[PDB]
Design a protein around this nucleic acid. Structure first.
Ligand SMILES: Nc1ncnc2c1ncn2[C@@H]1O[C@H](COP(=O)(O)OP(=O)(O)OP(=O)(O)O)[C@@H](O)[C@H]1O
Ligand SMILES: Nc1ncnc2c1ncn2[C@@H]1O[C@H](COP(=O)(O)OP(=O)(O)OP(=O)(O)O)[C@@H](O)[C@H]1O
Ligand SMILES: [Mg+2]
Ligand SMILES: [Mg+2]
Ligand SMILES: [Zn+2]
Lengths: 443, 175, 190, 649, 204
DNA sequence: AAAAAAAAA
């Protein structure tokens, strides 16, 4: 039982210590650079693992949830080996290292997931619609008894592979005549990590005919948290597993969910500067071009013919102005507004979608299917605890970017007056059900 | 102290609080009404390059014309803040030429309690500087950038030189 | 020369040049012993070895001459003693058993290694990858020891008994600047 | 084992080293003794230590406190209690009160470094560590006492027994749980009667603090954390207050690791045991030379014009608006009579004008410079939820009223934008407040009258896109006259086109935009900054550093800074209560009679309530110059301002 | 008053960054002599004021302390302005010599800025004088050494070279090279360094 | 109990 685990750990250690192409051991230097900056994590490219040996890839693809903790403890063993001197024999504050995977396999649409993808590694893409608040998870628990009153420690991993996975309390004491489970939890001298929940929605253009989009639930932990914001297209690599809901129709039902292993995002969470040196040099070189203005102006909607001043206005809007502040506290606006008011057939709507696509943060909405309460701030109540809480609309979702509104005249007169302050001062004030909050929205 | 040094020249331009220890008729013409003389104990914010010499000239009881008040940059609060945890301190906001002005201030006024604390501060920050410099990519979290934006003006030169040295060594090593 | 700040420290190319300006042993493939023919008659190397030479015998030449002959089929570079597994094992054991002393090692460390692995690939009796891995492990150990030792920087002096050329060069600017700053701070304080 | 004693004696050594805390403790003791039997305030047994001195004394203990307070604070508290017991000297104590056993809990102040966080920054690796968090008070719970130690007596034995109870939130260290079962029988079966008046009960309240929405990530809602505090400081502050709370951040509860869990994804509960609370206020006490300077400025002839000009220096013109705002921020006194009931005391101002004439900016300035103010938008508010709400508390299971927007602004000022766009229904909710400054809630079995004595300032647009000077003033304003008659001052502003004014305002606005923050270059945008270096903060009269106010020279007339003006307002609103005299009465009656019988066109009709406005304006102007009597000059200036606001120059 | 002078010096710092980040001699920025001559005009006004003040001091109606303090203040003003101007010009001359020393002293007008008109006429004549000095320096006892040659140590004898620009045929010692566009040579390293420095060859 | 969307008057 234990020998196979040791063999697998040894195989992974040999892989990580031996993998070199040309004259560089890439993973060891990656570990060094990660430890030096206090980022106890490692990234494995799947193609390298396949090329090194196929049996390890086969085992990982067969039972991922069981295999992965062995790899993630081999990583920390190697890190302690290649970072700490034994000195013929301390702090040793190195937790279990996080494993991150990347792959280039075929994508699978959300609606195509079925009973045959249970406990398998899958890759898929979607849109982020909501992020949950972070929560704590125990990893090393100090357990104390009452009658015999001794000390014990429990080590728990985050992978489950099954609904239970939980050793709540050992039956009987450790050897007089104590109870069944006479233990408590010593909250001090305990170690905790962080977990977060996310909701994913199907990409609009792959929705089947005459259907509505489907949502799914994903869970991430440690360094993968606090990475994605609502409204960002992402590519996820994870495990499609199921968990029971004893609190919650039918018989023997099990709600599926996704455990996040790796996230790729187009924006790369850049919006302080994090760009590569080569990219910064390329941007400076492009800015040195004597005719960058015409190059960018031609770039705005190349399939639209004739409009020039409109394209210049679009470029000036996307670039944006300069925010200013004053000693007495008065704010000054730093955005530019463009209104297109013309005859039909002049391709007004085709520019809006292109501007939405270009901008890093943009939302496209119609003035007909919209409401004043549904744009700035919606006051909802939790069905469980019955408490008022504030849910954002569309204008707050596009803060720091641009908002695309078409058919501005069809919008109701009552609705169109709410945007007055939201643009004249870029701050919205809500006084509903005793909630008095000033919310920021710059767009 | 180099005549043709840009950084020293820039650091010489900061303003220090000071007070007119002596009353001089006809002064203040460069700040207020020229015909109105400046009275005694008048507080002003003067640049270093003249406050240093006007406070030592004397002129003539050979009291100098101006007396330099303790600047707010060197206060007990900052001393406690740097003594508590210097590695995480955002010393860039307090000043951009902090080290050079500290050198000049300690030169004008010998204070054995400043050299040791400043030395310990920079010694502690140097290890983090080297740790970040040795971390060559093979693209980073928020910690590296948020430390890098807390740096002093002069520390950037050390960081860049170390990074270039390590990059050159790595480039020559792997070919 | 100036080139910005390149007047204060050596470039890695200069380090490689100064290292490769060193003697080495060679097993020649040809013979040019004088008929008892053009004299080598160099100006910065003993030509007696190059002129009085015979095949399948040991002799000492400068490293760059050995490399030039290795580019042709006139050379067979003899590997040094410290490029073998049985010596590197006792070496790594020495560093592991002694957590305070830098091990004795020639100052041409890592550089002769890079050059020999680059050019003299087929003349090693031991497999190349194992030797490269052992060298990498030694590099990691010495890096850890250097980081451990750097934690204290006195303003008076410092001692580093067994650091190679590249290790000294890659650390010179940071240590030099920090020590200069500390020294001038102390000097201004008194 | 013995480490507790070692820490206790080390802390005793540290306490003996510094002699300030001993002086404070003996002062508290002597004050408490004097409060006992001499012909209602008592000092709590709490002392605040500055951990800077602790760090300067012993770094090991300082680090132990700031990393793992669970093993360091209790020994310090025990040592402090032992010192207090040793120094105390009471020869004839009481019976029930002697068994209180207050352990003299501590409070901290000084630099925290990396342990001063925000509600969003709190994460897993900051657990079990002393922290200090800034934020805004969202909502509070009800004060409910909880048991600590019970006292029992048996008639047959005649021996008083006691049993002690503790919970997870009671103490920093986890211990074996004890239920609330009352011991009623002895070991030999003797009856035990619970003795009230000898047992111990401590107050308990829970509050929730929210991160400030101003410093939030783009497109992210604010997040909040909850704080538990007990015993002293149990009912400090209120919802809608900026606070800094220092305490221990620890987890509690099994959190599903027992058999009660239903699903895999079970998270723990986190909570902060607050140690101390400080008012942030983005300080509030005048110094001696501050009072000297205030008197020296008030004895000048033209202080009021200087103060009016000092308000919002980046707004061109509108000088009378600035004077009106100055008089409104420090309005007249309220009157109560045994037969006349109550008389309104403050001033409300309404402005109407065509777009782009700098009304909202002045409103924001008034928000920033006021002691207390609340921002409200007409469209984004509901009248029923503006005054009070009904919410069921999760703990007690009962429904209690939650304070509305205007109630929080009691004795403050409320600014409403887009007032004319605000729903007609909710308008009546405003009128009630304008009637008697009291809101009555009679719903779901609660009948209560809530005090709300605030002033309201609003700005509204005319019915048309631009003001029509040739039309009826009632025609241009959508609001009914019933509420318009309440406002004391009505202002109409128009952007008359004139090339001279256009050039002047263009030069001014261009001058404003060419500004650079001190010490920061112009090539890069503004970057966020960290908190203050000091978590909790705190030669005279010869410097005038910020007393004179003129930061930059631009005109012969003087200027004053915002902090000095706010200090002036704080001093004036408290230290002076002027009384009117007959000399101003004659002028007031003469000008009222003249204005009423001038018999010409006017912006609005006038009635008897305008004389009350004149009286309180004269009172406000008497307050401005810091006099206890009202002079005729105040009547003259009030009449001039009213004529400007109603006739026009 | 010399605050405007700081505006120059700060700008100079940015130039050093252009020298620093590039680590290469290219595109020296166009001068700022307008601010300099404004400073010269105001310091001339300062000198005139000082001479007038000294005149009144020698006349007798002026107080000695006022005269001495005004003289000290003005002298500090002149000193700081001169310091700023010299700090600018020293760096300018240093970078000028920097790119003058490596291009064989010919200034490479055939290829770097084209017209070099962003330099002042005084700076241009200084550049010509320094090129004259560079030409004279290797005309002494070091005539057999190319001082303006490569500074990378020679590491290999034969390299592959790929043609970058088209030309005819160029004679060498004992041979001739015809520069056909897009051709690859297998020649000696030390025979094509002059061409490589000029930019006619690529893929070292 | 309080906010928000829909069809008919
Ligand atoms: N200048 C143009 N160049 C190319 N195609 C154009 C141009 N103007 C209009 N079109 C074409 O007209 C069609 C309809 O355009 P679109 O619906 O965007 O017009 P619009 O002005 O937004 O209309 P509406 O006011 O009726 O909403 C598109 O297929 C678009 O390609
Ligand atoms: N006298 C003035 N001084 C400075 N800025 C001014 C002045 N008059 C107008 N402005 C500028 O006009 C702009 C319009 O601001 P704002 O929307 O607050 O004005 P408003 O009159 O309250 O308009 P609205 O009726 O749309 O609320 C601001 O950027 C403000 O700086
Ligand atoms: Mg359309
Ligand atoms: Mg406005
Ligand atoms: Zn037991």
């Amino acid at each position: 039982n234990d020998d196979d685990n040791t063999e697998i750990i040894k195989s992974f250690k040999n892989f990580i210590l031996e993998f070199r192409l040309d004259s560089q051991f890439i993973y060891r230097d990656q570990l060094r650079n990660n430890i030096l900056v206090k980022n106890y994590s490692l990234t494995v490219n799947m193609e390298h693992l396949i090329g090194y040996n196929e049996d390890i890839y086969k085992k990982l693809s067969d039972e991922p949830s069981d295999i992965i903790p062995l790899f993630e403890t081999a990583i920390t063993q190697v890190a302690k080996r290649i970072s700490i001197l034994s000195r013929a024999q301390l702090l040793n504050s190195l937790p279990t290292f996080q494993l991150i995977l990347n792959s280039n396999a075929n994508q699978i649409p959300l609606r195509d997931l079925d009973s045959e993808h249970v406990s398998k590694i899958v890759r898929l893409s979607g849109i982020i619609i909501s992020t949950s608040v972070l929560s704590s998870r125990a990893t090393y628990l100090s357990i104390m008894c009452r009658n015999c009153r001794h000390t014990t420690s429990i080590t728990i991993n985050n992978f489950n592979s099954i609904t239970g996975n939980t050793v709540s309390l050992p039956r009987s004491c450790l050897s007089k005549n104590c109870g069944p489970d006479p233990y408590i939890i010593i909250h001090e001298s305990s170690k905790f990590i962080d977990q977060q929940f996310l909701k994913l929605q199907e990409i609009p253009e792959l929705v089947p005919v005459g259907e509505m989009p489907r949502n799914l639930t994903m869970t991430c932990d440690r360094y993968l948290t606090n990475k994605v914001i609502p409204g960002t297209r992402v590519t996820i690599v994870g495990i499609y597993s199921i968990y029971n809901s004893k609190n919650g129709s039918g018989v023997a039902i099990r709600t599926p969910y996704i455990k996040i292993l790796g996230i790729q995002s187009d924006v790369e969470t850049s919006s302080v500067t994090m760009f590569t040196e080569e990219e910064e040099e390329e941007f400076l070189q492009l800015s040195r071009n004597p005719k960058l203005y015409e190059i960018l102006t031609n770039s705005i909607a190349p399939s639209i013919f004739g409009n020039e001043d409109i394209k210049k206005a679009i470029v000036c809007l996307l670039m944006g102005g300069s925010k200013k502040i004053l000693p007495d506290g008065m704010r000054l606006r730093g955005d530019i507004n463009v209104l297109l008011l013309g005859d039909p057939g002049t391709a007004k709507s085709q520019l809006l979608k292109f501007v939405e696509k270009v901008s890093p943060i943009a939302v496209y909405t119609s003035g007909k299917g919209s409401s004043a309460a549904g744009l700035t701030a919606s006051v909802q109540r939790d069905p469980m605890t019955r408490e008022f809480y504030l849910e954002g609309g569309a204008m707050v979702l596009a803060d720091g970017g641009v908002v695309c509104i078409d058919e501005f005249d069809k919008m109701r007169d009552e609705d169109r007056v709410a945007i007055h302050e939201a643009m004249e001062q870029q701050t919205i004030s809500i006084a509903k059900a005793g909630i008095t909050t000033v919310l920021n929205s710059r767009t | 102290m180099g005549y043709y040094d840009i950084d020293d020249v820039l650091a010489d331009g900061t303003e220090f609080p000071c007070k007119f220890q002596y009353d001089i008729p006809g002064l203040g013409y460069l700040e207020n009404n020229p015909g109105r003389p400046i009275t005694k104990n008048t507080k002003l914010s003067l640049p270093l390059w003249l406050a240093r010499i006007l406070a030592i000239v004397g002129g003539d009881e050979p009291v100098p014309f101006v007396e330099l008040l303790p600047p707010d940059m060197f206060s007990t609060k900052v001393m406690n803040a740097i003594k508590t945890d210097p590695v995480a301190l955002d010393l860039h906001s307090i000043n951009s030429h902090f080290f050079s002005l500290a050198i000049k201030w300690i030169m004008l006024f010998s204070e054995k309690e400043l050299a040791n604390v400043v030395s310990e501060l920079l010694l502690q920050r140097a290890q983090e500087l080297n740790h970040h410099a040795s971390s060559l990519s093979i693209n980073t979290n928020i910690a590296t950038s948020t430390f890098l934006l807390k740096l002093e003006e002069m520390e950037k030169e050390i960081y860049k030189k170390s990074h270039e040295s390590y990059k050159d060594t790595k480039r020559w090593m792997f070919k | 020369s100036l080139p910005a700040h390149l007047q204060q420290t050596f470039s890695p190319e200069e380090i490689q040049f100064i290292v490769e300006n060193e003697p080495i042993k060679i097993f020649p493939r040809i013979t040019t012993r004088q008929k008892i023919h053009t004299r080598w008659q160099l100006i910065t190397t003993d030509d007696k070895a190059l002129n009085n030479m015979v095949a399948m015998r040991s002799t000492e030449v400068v490293l760059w001459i050995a490399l030039l002959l290795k580019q042709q089929s006139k050379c067979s570079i003899v590997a040094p003693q410290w490029l073998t597994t049985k010596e590197l094992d006792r070496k790594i054991q020495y560093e592991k058993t002694h957590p305070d002393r830098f091990s004795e090692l020639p100052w041409n460390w890592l550089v002769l290694a890079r050059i020999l692995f680059n050019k003299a690939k087929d003349d090693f009796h031991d497999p190349i990858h194992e030797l490269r891995g052992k060298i990498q492990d030694l590099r990691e150990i010495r890096q850890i020891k250097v980081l451990k030792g750097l934690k204290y920087l006195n303003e008076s002096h410092l001692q580093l008994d067994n650091l190679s050329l590249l290790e000294i060069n890659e650390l010179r600017p940071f240590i030099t600047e920090i020590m200069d700053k500390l020294r001038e701070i102390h000097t201004a304080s008194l | 084992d013995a480490v507790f004693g070692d820490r206790v004696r080390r802390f005793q050594e540290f306490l003996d080293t510094f002699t300030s805390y001993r002086d404070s403790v003996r002062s508290i003791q002597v004050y408490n003794s004097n409060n006992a039997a001499n012909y209602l305030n008592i000092l709590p047994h709490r002392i605040i230590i500055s951990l800077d001195d602790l760090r300067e004394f012993d770094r090991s203990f300082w680090s132990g406190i700031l990393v793992e307070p669970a093993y360091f604070i209790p020994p310090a508290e025990k040592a402090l209690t032992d010192l207090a017991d040793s120094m105390d000297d009471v020869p004839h104590p009481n019976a029930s009160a002697v068994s209180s056993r207050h352990p003299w809990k501590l409070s901290f102040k000084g630099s925290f470094g990396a342990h001063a966080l925000s509600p969003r920054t709190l994460t897993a690796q900051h657990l079990n560590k002393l922290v200090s968090v800034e934020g805004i008070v969202t909502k509070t719970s009800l004060v409910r006492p909880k048991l600590i130690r019970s006292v029992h007596y048996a008639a047959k034995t005649g021996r008083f027994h006691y049993r002690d109870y503790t919970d997870a939130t009671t103490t920093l260290t986890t211990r074996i749980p004890t239920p609330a079962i009352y011991p009623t029988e002895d070991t030999e079966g003797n009856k035990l009667t619970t003795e009230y008046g000898y047992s111990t009960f401590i107050d308990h309240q829970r509050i929730t603090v929210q991160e400030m929405p101003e410093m939030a990530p783009a497109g992210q809602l604010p997040r909040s954390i909850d704080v538990i505090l007990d015993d002293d400081l149990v009912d400090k502050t209120k919802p809608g207050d900026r606070v800094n709370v220092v305490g221990v951040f620890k987890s509690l509860g099994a959190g599903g690791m027992n058999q009660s869990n239903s699903n895999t994804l079970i998270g723990f509960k986190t909570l902060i045991l607050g140690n101390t609370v400080y008012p942030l206020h983005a300080r509030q006490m005048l110094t001696d030379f501050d009072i000297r300077n205030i008197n020296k400025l008030s004895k000048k002839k033209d202080i009021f014009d200087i103060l009016s000009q000092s308000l919002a220096p980046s707004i061109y013109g509108h000088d009378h608006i600035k004077k009106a705002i100055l008089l409104m921020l420090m309005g007249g006194v309220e009157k109560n009579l045994e037969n006349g009931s109550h008389l309104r005391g403050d001033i409300n101002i309404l402005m109407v004008g065509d777009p782009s004439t700098a009304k909202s900016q002045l409103l924001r300035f008034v928000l920033n410079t006021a002691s207390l103010a609340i921002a409200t938008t007409g469209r984004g508010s509901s009248g029923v939820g503006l005054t009070a709400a009904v919410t069921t508390d999760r703990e007690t299971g009962e429904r209690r009223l939650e304070a509305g927007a205007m109630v929080l602004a009691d004795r403050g000022v409320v600014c409403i934008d887009e007032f004319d766009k605000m729903t007609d229904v909710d308008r009546v909710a405003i009128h009630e407040v304008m009637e008697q400054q009291t809101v009555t809630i009679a719903k779901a079995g609660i009948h209560t009258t809530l005090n709300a004595r605030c002033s309201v300032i609003a700005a509204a647009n005319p019915v048309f896109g631009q003001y029509d000077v040739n039309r009826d003033p009632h025609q241009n304003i959508a609001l009914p006259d019933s509420l318009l008659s309440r406002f004391d001052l009505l202002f109409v502003v128009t952007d008359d086109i004139n090339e001279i004014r256009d050039r002047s305002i263009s030069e001014h606005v261009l001058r404003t935009h060419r500004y650079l923050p001190p010490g920061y270059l112009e090539g890069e945008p503004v970057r966020e900054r960290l908190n203050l270096s000091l978590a909790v903060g705190e030669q005279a009269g010869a410097k005038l550093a910020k007393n004179k106010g003129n930061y930059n020279g631009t005109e012969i007339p003087k200027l004053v800074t915002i902090p000095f003006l706010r200090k002036y307002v704080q001093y004036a609103k408290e230290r002076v209560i002027p009384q009117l005299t007959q000399e101003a009465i004659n002028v007031i009656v003469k000008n009222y009679t003249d204005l009423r019988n001038d018999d010409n066109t006017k912006k609005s009709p006038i009635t008897a309530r305008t004389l009350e406005t004149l009286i309180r304006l004269a009172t406000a102007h008497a307050k401005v110059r810091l006099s206890k009597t009202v002079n005729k000059v105040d009547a003259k200036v009030a009449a001039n301002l009213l004529r400007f606001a109603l006739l026009g120059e | 008053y010399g605050d405007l002078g700081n505006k120059l010096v700060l700008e100079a710092k940015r130039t050093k960054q252009l020298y620093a980040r590039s680590n290469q001699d290219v595109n020296l920025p166009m001068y700022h002599e307008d601010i300099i001559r404004n400073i010269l005009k105001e310091v001339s006004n300062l000198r005139k004021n000082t001479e007038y003040l000294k005149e009144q001091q020698q006349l007798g109606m002026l107080d000695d302390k006022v005269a001495k303090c005004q003289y000290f203040v003005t002298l500090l003003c002149m000193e700081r302005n001169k310091r700023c101007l010299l700090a600018y010009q020293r760096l300018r001359t240093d970078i000028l010599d920097s790119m003058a020393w490596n291009n064989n002293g010919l200034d490479l007008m055939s290829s770097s800025q084209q017209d070099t008109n962003n330099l002042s006429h005084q700076e241009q004549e200084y550049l010509k004088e320094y090129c004259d000095l560079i030409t004279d320096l290797k005309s002494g006892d070091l005539v057999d050494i190319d001082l303006s040659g490569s500074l990378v140590p020679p590491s290999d004898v034969f390299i592959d070279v790929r043609v970058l620009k088209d030309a005819g045929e160029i004679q060498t010692e004992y041979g001739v090279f015809n520069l056909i566009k897009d051709s690859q040579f297998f020649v000696r390293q030390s025979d094509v360094e002059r061409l490589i420095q000029q930019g006619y060859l690529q893929k070292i």
